[PDB]
Amino acid sequence: ANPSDPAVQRIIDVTKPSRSNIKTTLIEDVEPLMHSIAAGVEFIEVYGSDSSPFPSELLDLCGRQNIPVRLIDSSIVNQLFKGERKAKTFGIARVPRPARFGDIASRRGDVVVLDGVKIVGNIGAIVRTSLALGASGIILVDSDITSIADRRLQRASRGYVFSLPVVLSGREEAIAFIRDSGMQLMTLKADGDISVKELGDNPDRLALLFGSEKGGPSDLFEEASSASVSIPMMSQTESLNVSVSLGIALHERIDRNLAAN
Amino acid sequence: ANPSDPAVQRIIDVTKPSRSNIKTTLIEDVEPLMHSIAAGVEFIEVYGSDSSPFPSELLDLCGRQNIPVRLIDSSIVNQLFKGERKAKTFGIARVPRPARFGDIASRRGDVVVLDGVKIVGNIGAIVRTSLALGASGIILVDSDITSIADRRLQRASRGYVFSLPVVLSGREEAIAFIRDSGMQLMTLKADGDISVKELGDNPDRLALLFGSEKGGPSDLFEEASSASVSIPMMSQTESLNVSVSLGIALHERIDRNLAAN
């Protein structure tokens, strides 16, 4: 373990602050770490607080992946971070190459397609929900996001932005991929023809499309769109937050996305 | 149509801006207005952008409640705006008295209870979801919100904050009200005993409890809590966002809450 200051550990104090270096980034907490490693994300070294029980399985995973792991005493860990108290566990990872359609095609499970969603808070929460409910990947269209390593997005996603393919794509390219991949594009809308409760019956791999406005997504998607899906509300004149709408849709598909895996 | 100053309509430029008193307020967007008046809120006057068709119906529900409406010019409508830009339909209103437990106890539908939820972003979205999915009301325990009026809770709620009973309360106060009301308390947690899918089966009106932590809600709600509810995920090792968890919870109760309206 290291209790002194620094040693060469200074790297941690470099990749964390509002520095510049992009090649590396910090991923906090055990679960984001576990899922990152599982997704092939390369790590330089994983750390942990000597005042916290280092998760047995992370230690093991890192072991079977040749990932070095060192303990750090409380005082130094407290110096870092704050005031979210503690990460208690974290690692230095090389920022992966941009995700591609190929990363989604080779995986199994529904695909989440966002169109016009720009608020990082929504995108972040959507990343978490998609991962937790068994989505294969996410395709972002018109999100104003240039890179997925955007720290705002990393933080908004609880550090899960690398745990599943998040592809930045143009509208036409996304449509072409979905079309030629054999997936069934489903447009979720408050005034959709089909009840969201009927999604569980669908045996096909689905591409669930969401917008940012109650009129979204772009009507230009209607061409590729196979059907419109609606989430029942008190009245269909209301609407739900896109992240909330995503959660319900994926919730209805949970069995199909578990069967896929 | 009035391009005149002050033209006395300058109320909007003393209520919308951050001034002195917390009484009246300005509500944007066409929808928030409808449900606001459809509850018991009083509007001094509603305005609208000129070069942009006016929503007929707002007039009917403003004529039967004696609420005046006047058109503003797009040069002045945007003289006070930025976006969207196309908020279009707004109007000053009078902040109602603080919500009471009785308000909820008189209305029908499951009750939502948040414990320790402080982030207004979630609380706001949680309001929309509760409203849209037919929740009787929300109890905000330990939210650090001094008043529902708070301009940040309004903006985070799109202006729907006055569409249903939102009660600020202490932990003991809320626990006492749920027992004396006969409602069955359900605590939602990742490692709950009952599945969220089984909620729709319960014939009784429910009180849904959500914490702010993964280790929440406060275990002091346990005695009152007669059951724990868990939403299935790829692995209970993780957890869902509070608003997403709520949406799914109410979604499974949609038939019972449509039954309560």
Ligand SMILES: C[S@@+](CC[C@H](N)C(=O)[O-])C[C@H]1O[C@@H](n2cnc3c(N)ncnc32)[C@H](O)[C@@H]1O
């Ligand atoms: C509804 S818009 C934002 C709400 C809108 N601006 C409003 O308040 O009127 C966000 C996204 O959530 C999705 N969504 C909202 N309600 C839905 C519902 N009831 N069923 C299916 N999708 C829904 C839509 O696809 C939309 O693109």
Ligand SMILES: C[S@@+](CC[C@H](N)C(=O)[O-])C[C@H]1O[C@@H](n2cnc3c(N)ncnc32)[C@H](O)[C@@H]1O
């Ligand atoms: C775990 S807390 C905090 C969630 C997340 N850490 C966040 O960004 O806020 C989320 C709340 O939603 C409820 N919740 C979360 N995951 C759930 C699940 N899998 N099943 C049922 N309820 C859940 C819990 O009551 C909890 O209080």
